[PDB]
Structure formats: C-alpha cells, structure tokens
C-alpha cells in the first residue's frame, strides 16, 4: 500500500474593514449635519 499553531488574520480583519467604513461614513454624516444644519441655521439667522 502506498498510503501508509498560527493566527488567522483574515477572519476578523474583515471586521476591521467594515468597522472602518463605519468610521468614515460616521464622520461623513457628522460633518454633513454639522456643516449643513449648523451653518444653514447660522446664515438662517442673518
């Protein structure tokens, strides 16, 4: 008869990715409401 420890970066690295897209969008909405609503109100005063 002729037949007789590591680390998986990938797995949650994906969740790094998603987490970071979450970051960028989060700040987008952030400064778009800050700029938009805030300044819209500011000039909306006078």
């Amino acid at each position: 008869g002729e037949c007789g420890s590591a680390l998986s970066l990938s797995n949650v690295a994906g969740v790094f990715y998603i987490l970071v897209g979450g970051l960028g969008l989060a700040m987008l909405v952030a400064l778009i409401e800050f700029c938009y609503k805030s300044r819209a109100e500011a000039k909306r005063m006078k």
Partner: protein, 145 residues
C-alpha cells in the same frame, strides 16, 4: 437615551453609572450577565482553536439518495448495475432511478474512469464500487479517496 445607550454598548465592552442604587442592581446584574457571556464565547473560541477538527458531513448511501449536489454512479456491464437495476429497496431503487437517467451519464466503462471522475470532480462525484477495490484504491496515490 443616547447617553444611556452609550452606557449600554460601553457597558458590554470591557464610565460610572451609579446613582439610584435601584439602578445599581441593574448595572451590576448587567456586568454579571455580559461577563458570563464574554467568558462563554471567549472559551468557546479557545475551544474552536483547540477543537473544530473537520469531519466529513455525509458518509452513507442514504445521504447520497437524499441529495443531488454530489453525483454518483456505477461500473457499466457489471453486477453493481444489476444490483441497482433489480434492487427493491426504496433508497437503492430511487438511486438507480436517478442514476439511469442522470445527465451527463454517471456510469463509467472502467474502474479507472470512475476513479478519475472522483479525483477530478472536486468532490462532486462519488463512485460506487466493490469494497475490495475501494480499499485497494485507498492505498493509492494521491490518497484523496
């Protein structure tokens, strides 16, 4: 509500809520509960490191009969084909009824052809053959059967 929800998320993950001490019990029993959790999934993982060694999902003829993802067939012009053609057992009859009209043909002219179909079909082909040949092949390269 926003600050409270932030206390919720931040509470779950690894500052100072207490006032009412009627809210204490809520806070602590949280920390308790989430703590049990984190312990639980944590060691659950560490096991997944240790254990989780793979096992084949299906080992039987009944599994083959109940699925269509993995094709299966027999040698042509042989006793196995007569067995299926004449079998009255529902699983084996149903398998014969599938195999005899499966397209492309699941039958092979030689044992070598059936082995080549097992080896080349990415696990999408299982071959039905006499046990003696199967155990012989089991001792053959590339030890993939």
């Amino acid at each position: 509500i926003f600050n409270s929800l932030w206390f919720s998320l931040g509470a779950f993950m690894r500052d100072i809520s207490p006032r009412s001490l009627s809210g204490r019990i809520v806070g602590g029993v949280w920390w308790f509960f989430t703590l049990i959790i984190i312990s639980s999934y944590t060691a659950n993982l560490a096991a997944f490191l240790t254990v989780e060694r793979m096992v084949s999902p299906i080992e039987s003829a009944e599994d083959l009969s109940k699925q269509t993802e993995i094709a299966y067939g027999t040698l042509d012009s042989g006793s196995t084909k007569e067995f299926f053609r004449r079998s009255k057992i529902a699983v084996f009859d149903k398998m014969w009824t599938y195999m005899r009209s499966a397209e492309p043909s699941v039958f092979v002219r030689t044992t070598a052809e059936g082995v080549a179909r097992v080896r080349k079909s990415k696990g999408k082909y299982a071959y039905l053959l006499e046990s003696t040949m199967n155990e012989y092949i089991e001792q053959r390269k590339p030890c993939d059967t």
